[PDB]
Design an enzyme around this catalytic site. Structure first.
Site, PDB file in Angstrom:
ATOM      1  N   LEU A  39       0.833  -1.190   0.000  1.00  0.00           N
ATOM      2  CA  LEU A  39       0.000   0.000   0.000  1.00  0.00           C
ATOM      3  C   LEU A  39       0.876   1.252   0.000  1.00  0.00           C
ATOM      4  CD1 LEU A  39      -2.855  -0.712   2.576  1.00  0.00           C
ATOM      5  CD2 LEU A  39      -2.791  -1.242   0.125  1.00  0.00           C
ATOM      6  N   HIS A  88      -2.983   1.460  10.246  1.00  0.00           N
ATOM      7  CA  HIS A  88      -3.868   0.773   9.317  1.00  0.00           C
ATOM      8  C   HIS A  88      -3.076  -0.267   8.541  1.00  0.00           C
ATOM      9  CE1 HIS A  88      -2.723   2.065   5.193  1.00  0.00           C
ATOM     10  NE2 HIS A  88      -2.135   3.048   5.852  1.00  0.00           N
ATOM     11  N   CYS A  89      -3.722  -1.396   8.249  1.00  0.00           N
ATOM     12  CA  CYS A  89      -3.140  -2.385   7.340  1.00  0.00           C
ATOM     13  C   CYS A  89      -4.116  -2.505   6.174  1.00  0.00           C
ATOM     14  CB  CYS A  89      -2.824  -3.683   8.067  1.00  0.00           C
ATOM     15  SG  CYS A  89      -4.207  -4.790   8.333  1.00  0.00           S
ATOM     16  N   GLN A  90      -4.688  -3.684   5.939  1.00  0.00           N
ATOM     17  CA  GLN A  90      -5.699  -3.864   4.907  1.00  0.00           C
ATOM     18  C   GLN A  90      -6.912  -4.570   5.495  1.00  0.00           C
ATOM     19  OE1 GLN A  90      -3.431  -5.650   1.396  1.00  0.00           O
ATOM     20  NE2 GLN A  90      -4.975  -4.435   0.300  1.00  0.00           N
ATOM     21  N   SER A  96      -2.587  -4.859  11.629  1.00  0.00           N
ATOM     22  CA  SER A  96      -2.640  -3.606  12.374  1.00  0.00           C
ATOM     23  C   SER A  96      -3.221  -3.800  13.767  1.00  0.00           C
ATOM     24  CB  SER A  96      -3.450  -2.572  11.589  1.00  0.00           C
ATOM     25  OG  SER A  96      -4.650  -3.134  11.081  1.00  0.00           O
TER      26      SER A  96
END
Length: 147
Positions: A39, A88-90, A96
């Protein structure tokens, strides 16, 4: 976009939430942690926030424990500097959330189980994989052993 506020200065999110710049500016977020490898750092060029990337994958071999202490520092720089912080991750917030739960274990006197369900209650979608859950259980035992 829902940025689940785990604390007053701590927000958990997903891929899309970091793109909602209007939302983040209302929350006075001044720090961002991207726990993914692919990302982008959304809004990097705008010069708005400080950034920290924890390049990890939502895999069964990924080691998040190495980044535990590195990310705790970014969060205490935000608290000491009176600014919000969004990690945040996904999507599934597996990565996260593991780091978030760990921040609560180290600085908050909470157990791994207590902290895991604190974050689970605020964001119901949290599903750290068992590889991350084993690290969290091992981080508890370490912290309890004077580590």
């Amino acid at each position: 976009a829902e940025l689940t506020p785990i604390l007053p200065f701590l927000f958990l999110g997903n891929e899309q939430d970091a793109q909602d710049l209007d939302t983040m500016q209302r929350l006075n977020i001044g720090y961002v942690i991207n726990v993914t490898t692919h990302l982008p750092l959304y809004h990097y060029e705008k010069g708005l926030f400080n950034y920290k990337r924890l390049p990890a994958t939502d895999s069964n071999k990924q080691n998040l424990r190495q980044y535990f202490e590195e990310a705790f520092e970014f969060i205490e720089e935000a608290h000491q500097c009176g600014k919000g912080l969004l990690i945040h991750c996904q999507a599934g917030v597996s990565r996260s959330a593991t780091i978030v739960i760990a921040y609560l274990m180290k600085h908050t006197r909470m157990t791994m189980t207590d902290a895991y369900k604190f974050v689970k209650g605020k964001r119901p979608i949290a599903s750290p994989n068992l590889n991350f859950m084993g690290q969290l259980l091992e981080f508890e035992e370490d912290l309890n052993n004077g580590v």
